Design a protein around this ligand. Structure first.
Ligand code: T1V
Ligand code: T1V
Lengths: 304, 304
């Protein structure tokens, strides 16, 4: 029993982290096979960051200007290219610790583990979600850029995020491993405001199911609702609209608990309208939205 | 910026997890040098668990009855001994992936990462604290026993916990790596009630400092207090008494923020007396007590 905000074991990703230095800028790279992936802004002076022309800046850079260090051993760079907002550094050595891997672009509401690194060295692991405004609420200091987000399916690491930016509001923006930003963000030190950070309704419902499974039941009520009625309430509380796709996705948790999804919706509706009245659910005084239905099933069944 | 509930990178501990089977009971072991550590209740049938006599049960067990599997390779057991509530299985092979390590017995209020495992395979990592009643609030299913808690100091893993028990209230009890239970708990399926789960005051203050550092300031007030006055309020709210040792420990966060510890105490006092009024601090509607002052400094400075 018990339900925790749980990250994937990070070992497979620890074995992929290196230090990239270009001039006086040091950040993290991901070493997979004979390619090191890092944020293209490694080539910038923080002056350049005001209005960088990355193609123009890159002309002035050679393979030997990219200093790649894996533990305390230097890798030889034999090639470099820009793909969107990431650099691919070709090195003469395949990472011997390359796990089975994919690059996936996740949807908003999807959760992932971050291995926070400084100078290519892991400092910690935590669980995130891609917010509906395509930000993440991370823990990232200067030097953390090139830290990656990932899911694991048994032996296969799916990389979904690389850290690039802190917005003025202290939320985070980054790319998939093809260098494409999540959301409308750009690797430029300019005015970038996030949109509405709405609550991930399907994740809140998943976590309400996790609470019932784990003995926290006080919030279960005698009511049901409809998707349309529930959605009026969600709109009013800046919750994401619930679709039949979400209802289908919660089917297994529905089955296990014998609580109809629309009944749990009616419970969530009362919690939005009445608040928690100083009570908690799985040790939280607010409705947690950074567990997917998949996360809840994984943790409640004990997948390795 | 940003502040997350952050676990140590788990790679060094992933490399230590094995499967121990005795008869029809499978749980996890920790392989360090040529010793595998696991919960002694591995030798029990769940019938035995009602009133086990472990010395008597152990007589009926030989080295060859302990099946130790590291990935998909069996280790040869050449010796076994009971130390308190753990078994030490001597194997003929040193774990090639043994990190630098210590066994430490932590104090209540101290935080640690748990690598949850099933059949010797890591499933997830999360951050815990030793509660003042010597329980932890974990995420542990059947098969998770022998999962370990740890801190890392650069290269040295300090093992502080091994998972043994779920209490009827769904909180967790376990041992240090010398097999001594935290608290008054015993590896017996009997009536064991936890004492008062008080709030770790010094940890709440550390997290209030982390909030100020990270731009969450609304709760800072114009008041100060004394240790004696603050402690009257703490007593009333089942918060741990604050000592001068705690004040000294918060000194660095005091210095960095320019907020006197006793001023931050007065802020905490108002939050206890007035509540959050529907506001949040670092994304939480309750006062977080599972970050130590050391954790806050580590995360806010970016130690690897
Ligand atoms: C994003 C990241 O981790 N970076 C880019 C900025 N540099 S830096 O310019 O060297 C700075 C260091 C402290 C303040 S800016 C660090 C790596
Ligand atoms: C604590 C732990 O992880 N254990 C001990 C109990 N066994 S068991 O008896 O095989 C059970 C499996 C499911 C219910 S009890 C599993 C390992």
């Amino acid at each position: 029993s018990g339900f925790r905000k749980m990250a994937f074991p990070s070992g497979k990703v620890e074995g992929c982290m290196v230090q990239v230095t270009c001039g006086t800028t040091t950040l993290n790279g991901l070493w997979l096979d004979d390619v090191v992936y890092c944020p293209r802004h490694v080539i910038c002076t923080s002056e350049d960051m005001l209005n960088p022309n990355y193609e123009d800046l890159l002309i002035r850079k050679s393979n030997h200007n990219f200093l790649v260090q894996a533990g305390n051993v230097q890798l030889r760079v034999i090639g470099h290219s820009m793909q969107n907002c990431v650099l691919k550094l070709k090195v003469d050595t395949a990472n011997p610790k390359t796990p089975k891997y994919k690059f996936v672009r996740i949807q908003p509401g999807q959760t992932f583990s971050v291995l926070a690194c400084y100078n290519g060295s892991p400092s910690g692991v935590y669980q995130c979600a891609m917010r509906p405004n395509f930000t993440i609420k991370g823990s990232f200091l200067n030097g953390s850029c090139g830290s990656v987000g990932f899911n694991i399916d048994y032996d296969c690491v799916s990389f979904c995020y690389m850290h690039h930016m802190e917005l003025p509001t202290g939320v985070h923006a980054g790319t998939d491993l093809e260098g494409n930003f999540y959301g409308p963000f750009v690797d430029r030190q300019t005015a970038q405001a996030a949109g509405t950070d709405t609550t991930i309704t399907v994740n809140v419902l998943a976590w309400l199911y996790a609470a019932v499974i784990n003995g926290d039941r006080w919030f279960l009520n005698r009511f049901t609702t409809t998707l349309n009625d529930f959605n009026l309430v969600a709109m009013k509380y800046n919750y994401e609209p619930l679709t039949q796709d979400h209802v289908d996705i919660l089917g297994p948790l529905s089955a296990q608990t014998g609580i109809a999804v629309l009944d749990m919706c009616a419970s969530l509706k009362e919690l939005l309208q009445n608040g928690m009245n100083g009570r908690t659910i799985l040790g939280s005084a607010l409705l947690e939205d950074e567990f997917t239905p998949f996360d809840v099933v994984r943790q409640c069944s004990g997948v390795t």
